[PDB]
Write an enzyme that holds these catalytic residues in place. Structure first.
Site, PDB file in Angstrom:
ATOM      1  N   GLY A 181       4.840   4.612   4.377  1.00 30.99           N
ATOM      2  CA  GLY A 181       5.596   3.377   4.270  1.00 30.99           C
ATOM      3  C   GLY A 181       7.025   3.609   3.838  1.00 30.99           C
ATOM      4  CE  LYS A 228       8.096   4.279  -5.132  1.00 29.63           C
ATOM      5  NZ  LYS A 228       7.688   3.024  -5.850  1.00 29.63           N
ATOM      6  CG  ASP A 235       5.708  -6.715  -4.224  1.00 26.65           C
ATOM      7  OD1 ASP A 235       5.966  -7.796  -3.638  1.00 26.65           O
ATOM      8  OD2 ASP A 235       5.749  -5.594  -3.669  1.00 26.65           O
TER       9      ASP A 235
HETATM   10  C1  LIG Z   1       1.703   0.498   0.315  1.00 27.32           C
HETATM   11  C2  LIG Z   1       3.157   0.713  -0.089  1.00 27.32           C
HETATM   12  C3  LIG Z   1       3.978   1.186   1.106  1.00 27.32           C
HETATM   13  C4  LIG Z   1       3.300   1.703  -1.194  1.00 27.32           C
HETATM   14  C5  LIG Z   1       4.148   1.832  -2.224  1.00 27.32           C
HETATM   15  N1  LIG Z   1       3.829   2.963  -2.935  1.00 27.32           N
HETATM   16  C6  LIG Z   1       2.824   3.503  -2.322  1.00 27.32           C
HETATM   17  C7  LIG Z   1       2.114   4.782  -2.572  1.00 27.32           C
HETATM   18  S1  LIG Z   1       0.379   4.661  -3.065  1.00 27.32           S
HETATM   19  C8  LIG Z   1      -0.553   4.891  -1.608  1.00 27.32           C
HETATM   20  C9  LIG Z   1      -1.680   5.647  -1.523  1.00 27.32           C
HETATM   21  N2  LIG Z   1      -2.381   5.370  -0.371  1.00 27.32           N
HETATM   22  C10 LIG Z   1      -1.753   4.463   0.333  1.00 27.32           C
HETATM   23  N3  LIG Z   1      -2.395   3.846   1.376  1.00 27.32           N
HETATM   24  C11 LIG Z   1      -1.873   2.877   2.169  1.00 27.32           C
HETATM   25  O1  LIG Z   1      -0.882   2.197   1.919  1.00 27.32           O
HETATM   26  C12 LIG Z   1      -2.478   3.039   3.534  1.00 27.32           C
HETATM   27  C13 LIG Z   1      -1.298   3.185   4.528  1.00 27.32           C
HETATM   28  C14 LIG Z   1      -1.273   1.976   5.461  1.00 27.32           C
HETATM   29  N4  LIG Z   1      -2.411   2.087   6.389  1.00 27.32           N
HETATM   30  C15 LIG Z   1      -3.596   2.580   5.665  1.00 27.32           C
HETATM   31  C16 LIG Z   1      -3.502   2.129   4.209  1.00 27.32           C
HETATM   32  S2  LIG Z   1      -0.136   4.076  -0.133  1.00 27.32           S
HETATM   33  O2  LIG Z   1       2.467   2.785  -1.226  1.00 27.32           O
END
Ligand SMILES: CC(C)c1cnc(CSc2cnc(NC(=O)C3CCNCC3)s2)o1
Ligand SMILES: CC(C)c1cnc(CSc2cnc(NC(=O)C3CCNCC3)s2)o1
Lengths: 276, 276
Positions: free
Chosen positions: A9, A31, A111
């Site tokens: 993302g 991230k 959020d």
């Molecule tokens: C979600 C948002 C952008 C964000 C901010 N910070 C983090 C990091 S934490 C995460 C760990 N697994 C994650 N899995 C998902 O979002 C998935 C991806 C979309 N399709 C399958 C589901 S994101 O994500």
């Protein structure tokens, strides 16, 4: 050493990459920006719970998280008329537990939306994206259009953010899980206030007063709705009645009437459900 | 009068809503900001073709498009090891046709990526998001990390944008359709140049010179790769050899060696494929 598999993302939070440990083959979400990375890491260390996304490690600043297979947004895309009533209750219970841990640690998420509700392969919901979370003992980000669909009317009107409005977002998500539809889909702030009153009736005097004192709305027409529909009517044949009661107490227009986490987790809806 | 069903997307392009005509029940995507809306509408009127997303109407400025059921990004998520070789060829042919119409109208798209390749219910690929497109007869936006994965090395190095780099992006997408993997997944610009040379060998003298003249890279280490792998090796057992040839001529490092649209559509790979 991580091989990049793809982009999870990108937004105000920054950039999240889907990565794999070259040695363990574990998939993670990493991230990085390009700010509030350090704030997030502090909150993530404080906030450890089954319904909150696990931060696995930090280095040079980059945050490595567990990678989770899906979010609620994808679930509503696969099931556009809602999920089974049992699943609605199960997910809202888990979400409430995650917010409860946040609030007990003096953290408001700010959020909550389907996009940040991760649903694991074992159907475990996890909250993420604390890039706008705040600790109430300090001072002080925000988002886009989908992120106002879950905002309480007093927040649309400019009130300060607190535990109440996270409870508001929970109610919006309760409804959308039950029928697949965004509950208050305004096309602008004003159309959002219309949709809210079209379901719940006129805002309390004080919110309308903020409407006339807030220059965002200078000279604008207040969206008066004559005949409110009601949630009982809005969700008849969709929510069972006990959960409908819980949703009625999350979506009180006056934030002072909303159930906070302790009351939500004590509601009759989740009596047999807490045990599992 | 449109009822809002949900948010399709939000970014630099603005906000796209999934909407429904209250009278026809037709689902549309409505684009609004909060700029380059008028530029996009002009290009969309010029650019009318089966592989380019149809703009249906404009009002007050908002653009109403056909709503399309999926994009390529979702397809690669459902099929993470690539799509069938027949489907790889079919989608790249259709994409090339859409870029050909853009280029014949003196328009370069500038943001080709899986996210803006819509795949209809009839498996018809459509290009969208002309919010960064440019007409070469005028003057002059850009994007995020996933959007540099498809950028030619000379563009990473700061060269001007032209038809060549759209052809570069086509090649990157060809590869990713064939095995599900981003071909040049840099974690930063420099790691992208490394990945590119790790497959295609050292950049031509002139691109390296831009590397030392560009202050973005001041004092930085050039990512020298000793032993390039080669696309033949990279895609052995994945692409048939004729399509591999086409990909070899889309991914020439020197933009002067890349096939443009007319040459791509004349390649042997698409000889039986043009007919259908
Ligand atoms: C979600 C948002 C952008 C964000 C901010 N910070 C983090 C990091 S934490 C995460 C760990 N697994 C994650 N899995 C998902 O979002 C998935 C991806 C979309 N399709 C399958 C589901 S994101 O994500
Ligand atoms: C795509 C990007 C954000 C953009 C810029 N401008 C427009 C408007 S044109 C469109 C018409 N149909 C569309 N369909 C899709 O993107 C869907 C939604 C994602 N899941 C299913 C596939 S978007 O989109």
């Amino acid at each position: 050493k991580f091989e990049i598999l793809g982009v999870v993302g990108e937004g105000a939070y920054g950039v999240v990459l889907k990565c794999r440990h070259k040695e363990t083959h574990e998939i993670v979400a990493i991230k990085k920006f390009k700010e509030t990375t350090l704030r997030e890491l502090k909150m993530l260390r404080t906030l450890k719970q089954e319904n909150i996304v696990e931060l696995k490690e930090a280095f040079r600043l980059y945050l490595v998280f567990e990678y989770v297979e899906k979010n609620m947004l994808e679930l509503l895309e696969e099931m556009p008329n809602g999920v089974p009533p049992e699943k609605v209750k199960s997910y809202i219970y888990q979400l409430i537990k995650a917010i409860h841990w946040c609030h007990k640690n003096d953290i408001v998420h700010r959020d909550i939306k389907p996009e940040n509700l991760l649903i694991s392969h074992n159907d475990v919901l996890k909250l993420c994206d604390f890039g706008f979370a705040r600790n109430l003992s300090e001072g002080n980000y925000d988002e886009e259009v989908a992120t106002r669909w879950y905002r309480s009317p007093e927040l649309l009107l400019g009130a300060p953010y607190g535990k109440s409005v996270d409870m508001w977002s929970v109610g919006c998500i309760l409804g959308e899980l039950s029928d697949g539809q965004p509950l208050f889909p305004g096309e602008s702030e004003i159309d959002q206030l219309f949709t809210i009153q079209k379901v719940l009736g006129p805002l309390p005097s004080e919110q309308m007063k903020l409407f006339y004192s807030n220059p965002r709305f200078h000279g604008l027409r207040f969206p008066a709705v004559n005949h409110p529909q009601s949630l009982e009517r809005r969700y008849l044949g969709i929510l069972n009645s006990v959960l409908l009661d819980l949703m009625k107490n999350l979506l009180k227009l006056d934030p002072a009437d909303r159930y906070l986490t302790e009351q939500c987790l004590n509601h009759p809806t989740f009596q047999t459900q807490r045990l599992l």
